[PDB]
């Protein structure tokens with residue numbers, strides 16, 4: 001009877017994963033994907049946040065900043081480089097957009113080969129088992145399905161303040177900005193703000209981060225503070241405990257000139273400065289309010305906008321599932337959405353019973369000095385297991401590659417958190433250093449096997465590689481021992 | 491009736507570890523370390539092979555090569571770099587030697603602080619519990635100890651051929667070469683040869699590798715071949731199944747000109763070419779023949795020169811121990827020698843029972859495209875567990891960072907080897923790609939916890955990071971499925 005076995009609302013990370021996997025079982029599948037424009041009119045193609053305005057262009061721009069560092073390092077390794085290489089914003093974003101565009105077309109082609117109907121249209125439920133697809137020109141069409149997957153992700157939140165929508169940009173706009181941002185104010189202090197401030201400084205821009213309260217709420221606060229200090233020592237300026245109150249345009253331009261006014265968080269003080277660009281990185285809102293959930297009876301958390309879901313990704317309505325960023329109490333990460341989507345299609349059409357495991361999922365912040373972790377933060381381990389049952393082994397280290405450029409000794413830092421009640425099970429893993437992500441992935445695998453501290457110590461390091469530090473952590477926070485190099489021992 | 495509790499012969503990786511650890515227990519310790527010069531008169535300072543003529547300078551030169559690549563990549567990411575950056579050998583080796591020099595002094599200081607007597611002198615046993623230290627000027631002194639640790643390492647092997655000692659250089663000489671090597675022949679095909687051929691090409695030299703038989707004997711042969719093909723594609727020329735027969739000098743110089751003659755391995759064919767530098771990387775010999783082992787009754791394997799040892803690093807003579815490269819049937823790696831040395835001191839003076847675990851020790855080859863691995867090679871897993879009990883999951887991948895420079899798709903490769911008789915225990919782990927070492931270290935930890943294929947698949951990747959490929963290997967070699975990108979799916 002129904003038009004499709006499965007209609008997927010949203011063609012991002014989770015959505016496309018679910019589609020590609022469901023297509024393996026010869027089912028009629030349709031992906032609806034539509035990108036509503038930013039307040040400034042920015043649009044993009046198929047593939048979701050990660051592909052167009054997230055991980056992909058972010059890491060590419062991170063890379064652009066790393067390369068700036070590599071240019072300086074090269075002098076000391078014998079490359080006869082002149083004194084300063086200038087960076088060119090427009091050339092960079094052109095390359096980035098070029099890659100993105102080929103991902104856009106890669107997916108469009110992938111869907112076609114897998115025989116998945118792709119409809120570039122906004123999905124909205126109209127009643128049980130029925131959905132309306134409104135296309136770009138306003139034309140509607142109604143479709144029915146046996147099952148639905150909500151995979152609509154989130155969008156950047158604005159402040160409630162005068163001028164923010166008309167003058168500020170968000171990450172959605174940053175990655176295809178047609179001109180160089182110039183002097184920038186980044187408002188916010190989580191992974192988006194820090195990563196962006198990070199690479200904008202790295203390519204040579206004057207950058208300021210305005211912080212409401214703490215850096216990286218949710219992450220290990222000592223790690224967060226170390227990332228903060230590093231950014232401060234390498235250019236990025238920080239304004240602590242201030243929130244903007246208005247953004248007014250002094251001059252239009254590409255970039256123009258903007259006057260930002262901010263109020264203290266605890267006092268009455270006021271500050272003004274002017275910038276070329278104000279980037280808002282102050283959280284994201286779930287796209288669940290305008291997809292007609294009332295008409296099919298799907299319950300969402302009204303305050304947060306997230307969708308509560310069974311451990312099988314089922315909503316309260318038996319035939320409607322949800323995946324990715326919109327899920328209540330989950331994690332907002334591409335590979336999680338992809339795994340969730342893939343395993344869902346497996347359970348539905350492949351007779352699998354494998355659920356998606358959301359415990360100890362590794363993450364990485366691509367701040368100038370990268371931060372990789374997995375498991376519990378120190379504070380959370382203490383909360384969960386009790387202060388005197390936790391042992392923290394830690395150490396600084398110095399990447400061999402930095403010795404010859406002769407920079408940044410005792411900045412990189414590694415800690416493992418152990419549960420003394422459980423054979424010193426490693427319940428948290430943290431690294432601050434180059435290629436933090438590469439380092440962390442493997443250790444996340446070991447956490448899944450219940451790695452103990454004596455198993456860790458019995459693993460031999462690879463030399464000379466930063467990651468080897470973890471096989472030799474012998475100094476505890478409790479012992480109070482010194483952990484500075486150099487060091488230079490055996 | 492002892493001067494010292496422990497005399498360590500050799501102040502390398504293992505020796506210095508054992509010394510630093512033994513010193514924790516307030517024992518009288520002496521390190522003897524002397525560097526006998528290369529045939530060309532090269533020597534160096536405290537620290538052993540790894541510090542002076544191995545891991546450290548090798549990685550630093552590898553880094554010089556990667557930075558060459560980074561200069562090229564930077565153009566696409568918007569850095570207005572001109573067309574060619576020349577490299578300067580003398581400036582590079584100055585920086586490298588500088589760092590090495592500070593490690594030399596670092597250790598010399600570390601030993602002094604730890605109250606370890608350091609004697610820059612050649613050790614030679616003269617009789618039970620007695621050793622002779624011959625210093626640089628030929629002055630002898632006799633010392634006694636309750637225990638001795640032999641930690642003397644190895645030295646480059648030469649060929650049995652005319653001109654090799656007088657005209658060729660080895661790794662011992664390479665890292666402090668006072669002039670640029672120019673057009674180079676590397677003889678040999680294991681980790682030393684390929685690593686060196688690698689970075690010499692990377693800094694812009696004309697490089698030829700001459701191979702006797704196969705590449706990287708002992709490592710997974712398919713991995714070896716891939717490394718080989720990559721090197722061929724990126725400059726390095728290979729001469730297959732040839733062995734040099736003589737090296738004659740055409741002209742002295744810095745570099746001079748050398749005429750190398752080589753004979754086919756299976757036919758009668760002869761080839762001549764001329765080079766600026768011939769680098770011999772054809773194995774190393776244990777320094778165990780000239781340390782007076784006869785006089786104390788220590789048994790060595792006569793053919794190989796290695797010392798057989800109990801699982802506690804004890805020789806047949808109860809009071810004499812051996813560590814590091816000289817050990818029979820072990821592995822010749824810095825962190826192994828360090829661990830062995832550190833744990834030995836723990837057993838002897840710390841009442842520990844923890845032995846050094848030599849199974850599944852991760853290694854990395856720093857060829858231009860790095861190769862990391864841990865556990866068994868495919869062929870060894872088949873030999874050990876039987877062909878139809880092995881499942882190999884594998885995939886090519888394309889580092890996000892390479893997409894914008896737009897190079898080298900489908901070169902990086904990952905595979906895991908699983909035992910079907912043992913819940914698909916991952917028994918071998920192989921990766922070819924950037925930061926291979928960083929990726930591998932963590933997975934080596936997981937192998938110590940008996941990581942299974944399903945545990946692997948339940949671990950969520952970090953996006954976008956190369957290492958994440960391992961969380962999603964779904965195509966087996968047995969299935970015959972295609973594994974080429976791009977691809978681009980969900």
Ligand SMILES: Cc1cc2nc3c(=O)[nH]c(=O)nc-3n(C[C@H](O)[C@H](O)[C@H](O)COP(=O)(O)OP(=O)(O)OC[C@H]3O[C@@H](n4cnc5c(N)ncnc54)[C@H](O)[C@@H]3O)c2cc1C
Pocket residue numbers: 009010011012013014015032033034035036047048049050051053054055058121122123124151152153154171192287290291323324325326332333334335337952953954
């Ligand atoms: C700046 C930034 C950096 C990030 N860095 C990382 C990182 O390094 N690593 C990582 O793992 N994650 C990162 N993330 C998070 C990651 O991108 C998201 O968690 C992931 O893309 C979520 O996937 P999803 O399928 O839930 O939503 P999305 O991928 O956003 O998919 C949503 C799709 O549905 C469309 N849509 C919405 N409503 C409708 C509708 N009604 N009808 C039709 N289509 C609709 C949207 O336009 C979008 O295409 C980053 C995010 C940002 C913003």
Ligand SMILES: Cc1cc2nc3c(=O)[nH]c(=O)nc-3n(C[C@H](O)[C@H](O)[C@H](O)COP(=O)(O)OP(=O)(O)OC[C@H]3O[C@@H](n4cnc5c(N)ncnc54)[C@H](O)[C@@H]3O)c2cc1C
Pocket residue numbers: 462463464499500501502503504505522523524525526537538539540541543544545548611612613614641642643644661682777780781813814815816822823824825827
């Ligand atoms: C080019 C090259 C690259 C390498 N790359 C890596 C790598 O990336 N990773 C890795 O883990 N390993 C690498 N290795 C191997 C590693 O460096 C060695 O395994 C390690 O140094 C061995 O430690 P050791 O303490 O056994 O011997 P060594 O470190 O060599 O110590 C031996 C010391 O004893 C001295 N000595 C010898 N005889 C006497 C005597 N009779 N009296 C006094 N002193 C004496 C020697 O001069 C030397 O200083 C590399 C080796 C080479 C040659």
